[PDB]
Amino acid sequence: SSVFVPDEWEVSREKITLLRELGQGSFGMVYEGNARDIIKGEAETRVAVKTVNESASLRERIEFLNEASVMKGFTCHHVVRLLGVVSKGQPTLVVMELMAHGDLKSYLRSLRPEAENNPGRPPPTLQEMIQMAAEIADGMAYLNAKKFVHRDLAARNCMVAHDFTVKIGDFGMTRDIYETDYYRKGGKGLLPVRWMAPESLKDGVFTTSSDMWSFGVVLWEITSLAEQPYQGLSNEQVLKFVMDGGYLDQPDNCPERVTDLMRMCWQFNPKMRPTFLEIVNLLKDDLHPSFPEVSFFHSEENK
Ligand code: EMC
Numbered sequence: 001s002s003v004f005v006p007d008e009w010e011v012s013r014e015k016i017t018l019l020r021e022l023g024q025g026s027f028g029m030v031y032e033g034n035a036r037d038i039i040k041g042e043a044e045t046r047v048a049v050k051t052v053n054e055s056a057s058l059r060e061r062i063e064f065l066n067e068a069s070v071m072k073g074f075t076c077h078h079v080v081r082l083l084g085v086v087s088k089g090q091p092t093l094v095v096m097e098l099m100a101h102g103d104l105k106s107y108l109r110s111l112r113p114e115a116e117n118n119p120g121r122p123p124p125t126l127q128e129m130i131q132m133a134a135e136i137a138d139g140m141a142y143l144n145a146k147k148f149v150h151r152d153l154a155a156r157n158c159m160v161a162h163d164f165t166v167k168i169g170d171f172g173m174t175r176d177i178y179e180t181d182y183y184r185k186g187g188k189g190l191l192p193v194r195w196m197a198p199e200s201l202k203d204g205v206f207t208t209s210s211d212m213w214s215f216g217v218v219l220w221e222i223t224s225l226a227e228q229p230y231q232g233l234s235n236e237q238v239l240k241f242v243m244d245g246g247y248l249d250q251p252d253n254c255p256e257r258v259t260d261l262m263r264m265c266w267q268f269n270p271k272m273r274p275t276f277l278e279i280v281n282l283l284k285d286d287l288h289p290s291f292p293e294v295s296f297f298h299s300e301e302n303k
Pocket residue numbers: 075076077078142294295296297299301
C-alpha cells in the first residue's frame with residue numbers, strides 16, 4: 001500500500017547528486033550527497049540519501065517509501081529529520097539531514113587524547129555532557145510522545161550536528177564497525193546486550209522504560225568517551241551481571257546530580273526509572289539559551 005508524502009516533500013531527482021557511500025541502511029546503501037534548493041535559504045545542502053537494495057522485492061520497495069512517510073511525521077530539532085523524497089522513477093531516494101559529525105559513538109571516540117582522528121577539541125565538558133543529555137532525552141521524549149520505543153538507543157544511534165547538537169537517528173547499521181555492540185543471546189538474534197535493561201534481557205520486552213536504561217548507558221558513554229559497557233565482561237557475563245541487578249560503575253569526577261541521574265536510569269524496577277520528560281525537567285535549568293526555542297519539552301506539543 002504505497003502511501004506518499006505531501007507535495008512539499010517530493011524532491012525533483014535532478015536536485016540530488018550522490019557523492020559517495022556512507023554505509024548500509026535497513027533497506028540498502030546510504031550515500032552522502034548534495035541536494036539543491038531543499039532547505040530554505042540554502043542553494044545546496046549536504047544530505048544523507050537512503051536507497052533500497054536492488055535485490056529488494058516490490059513489497060520491500062513500497063515498505064521503504066512508506067517508512068519515509070512515517071519518518072516524515074517525526075519533526076523535532078532533536079531527531080534526525082527527513083528532508084524529502086524522490087518517489088518517482090528509479091531508484092527512489094529518501095533524503096535525510098546529514099549530521100556533520102556523524103554518530104555520537106564515533107564522535108566520542110575521536111575525542112580521546114590519542115585518537116588519530118581527534119578533531120582538536122577536548123572531550124565534552126560537564127556543561128556539554130548535560131546539554132547532550134537533555135537533547136537526547138528531549139528527542140526521546142518527542143519519540144515516546146509519538147509512542148515510539150527505540151529498542152536500540154545507544155551513542156552509535158545518535159548523531160552530532162555541526163554545532164554539536166545531539167539528535168536521535170541512525171541509518172540502520174547493526175553490522176558495521178559496531179558489530180561487536182550486538183550479541184546473539186542464546187545463539188539467537190543479534191541484541192545490543194550491553195545497552196539492554198534487565199527486563200529486556202530476561203523477557204525480551206522493550207518499553208520506554210528500557211529505553212531509559214539505555215539512555216543511562218548513553219550518558220555513561222559520554223563520560224567514558226564510548227568505551228564498551230562492561231568492557232571487562234564477556235557477553236554471557238553481561239547477561240548474568242545485568243539480570244542480577246548489576247549496573248555500570250559511577251563515573252569519576254562527575255557531579256552527584258549527574259551520577260544520581262544515571263543511577264535512576266539503572267533502577268532495577270522499570271517503574272522506578274525516570275521518564276524522558278523528567279530527565280529534561282531535571283536538566284532544563286542549565287542549558288544553552290536556544291533550548292526552549294527548539295525542545296519538545298518546552299513546546300506546545302508537550303501535552
Ligand atoms: C518542537 C517539538 Hg521537538
